[PDB]
Design a protein around this ligand. Structure first.
Ligand SMILES: NC(=O)c1ccc[n+]([C@@H]2O[C@H](COP(=O)([O-])OP(=O)(O)OC[C@H]3O[C@@H](n4cnc5c(N)ncnc54)[C@H](OP(=O)(O)O)[C@@H]3O)[C@@H](O)[C@H]2O)c1
Ligand SMILES: O=C(O)Cn1c2ccccc2c2n[nH]c(=S)nc21
Ligand SMILES: O=C(O)Cn1c2ccccc2c2n[nH]c(=S)nc21
Length: 316
């Protein structure tokens, strides 16, 4: 298992990264410092996570300390939904660069295919509670992303939460200049995503699996919800390999040629989650894990089901 995967822009992306959604601003600086100290070279960020400044403090300290060189890091962020307007894309990227204290991103993603009305609110609502959409065509947003490559702000561009028809729309864009390098999507044994993954891979688009542990800290979690980390079948596979359930859950997407971005702010877990390059799940193990699919989606964007570009009505 090589540590990096080749992207269609010619750059190599570390297959393991640190997630930062929900990482409290008072804990994420140390989390990122620890991650870099124990070998992580890829950090997954977003403006909407409200902690890019604090992530940036950690990156900057580790660069200053010469623990790692900038070229060895792979920093990813994402364009929020309220910045899909073509004229707002560059400023959104620049704000993220300023907070992260970087002069380029390795990868910048359209966070969701749904554009919202611009403004200070991340989820602008009408008086009846519906999200207020943007009229900006995703193809125009893509053209604005391509400009960021040409102006040196980002090395690669990609998409997130795009269904196969939405990916296809980008791939079929008249005058397409740069293909998406990555589609970042939810993926774990309860939402195995075989159809979308095969589609993306067949087009040379690398898939990043998010919420690989089932996002047990998602704010809308219910006590009775399924729990990957507590699934006795997955526990048994872990025990067979003398690994933790989390380690199996992280190794699983790696062996499907995916990138994976588990989140933790706990130093012991950040280290545990990185120790996944010393064992191999069997083909049987892999198929068995795939068999647990229930089409259970922890990030379903229920707030936006009425939006014309809501991605999850389609089968895949
Ligand atoms: N593009 C998108 O729309 C999108 C959506 C969702 C997520 N993401 C990205 O994907 C990242 C990962 O997804 P996620 O944050 O939703 O959830 P996740 O990585 O599946 O799970 C995070 C949870 O698991 C716990 N955890 C981590 N390692 C553990 C271990 N070894 N043992 C036991 N528990 C462990 C963490 O606790 P502690 O932190 O307390 O240690 C936290 O509560 C996000 O942070 C974000 O960067 C992107
Ligand atoms: O977009 C993300 O990366 C995670 N995330 C969020 C991150 C920050 C703020 C809101 C959200 C959110 N709301 N719904 C869903 S399904 N996922 C959400
Ligand atoms: O609607 C969203 O954008 C996120 N979200 C929520 C946001 C606020 C309150 C509840 C939820 C919720 N419940 N289930 C799921 S899959 N997603 C949820």
């Amino acid at each position: 298992m090589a540590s990096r995967i080749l992207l269609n822009n010619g750059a190599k992306m570390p297959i393991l990264g640190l997630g930062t959604w929900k990482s409290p601003p008072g804990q994420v600086t140390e989390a990122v410092k620890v991650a870099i100290d124990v070998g992580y070279r890829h950090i997954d960020c977003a403006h909407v996570y409200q902690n890019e400044n604090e992530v940036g403090v950690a990156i900057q300290e580790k660069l200053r300390e010469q623990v790692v060189k900038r070229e060895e890091l792979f920093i990813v962020s994402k364009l929020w939904c309220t910045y899909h307007e073509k004229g707002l894309v560059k400023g959104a990227c620049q704000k993220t660069l300023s907070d992260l204290k970087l002069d380029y991103l390795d990868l910048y993603l359209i966070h969701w295919p749904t554009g919202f009305k611009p403004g200070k609110e991340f989820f602008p609502l009408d008086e009846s509670g519906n999200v207020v959409p943007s009229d900006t065509n995703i193809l125009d947003t893509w053209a604005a992303m391509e400009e960021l490559v040409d102006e040196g702000l980002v090395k690669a561009i990609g998409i997130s939460n795009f269904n196969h028809l939405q990916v296809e729309m980008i791939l079929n864009k008249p005058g397409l200049k740069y293909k998406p390098a990555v589609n970042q999507i939810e993926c774990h044994p309860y939402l195995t995503q075989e159809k979308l993954i095969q589609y993306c891979q067949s087009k040379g688009i690398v898939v990043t699996a998010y919420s690989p542990l089932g996002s047990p800290d998602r704010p809308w979690a219910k006590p009775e919800d399924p729990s990957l980390l507590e699934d006795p079948r997955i526990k048994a596979i872990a025990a067979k390999h003398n690994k933790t359930t989390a380690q199996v859950l992280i190794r699983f997407p790696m062996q499907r040629n995916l990138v994976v971005i588990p989140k933790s702010v706990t130093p012991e877990r950040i280290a545990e989650n990185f120790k996944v390059f010393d064992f191999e799940l069997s083909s049987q193990d892999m198929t068995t894990l795939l068999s647990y699919n229930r089409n259970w989606r922890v990030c379903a964007l229920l707030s936006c089901t009425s939006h014309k570009d809501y991605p999850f009505h389609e089968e895949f």
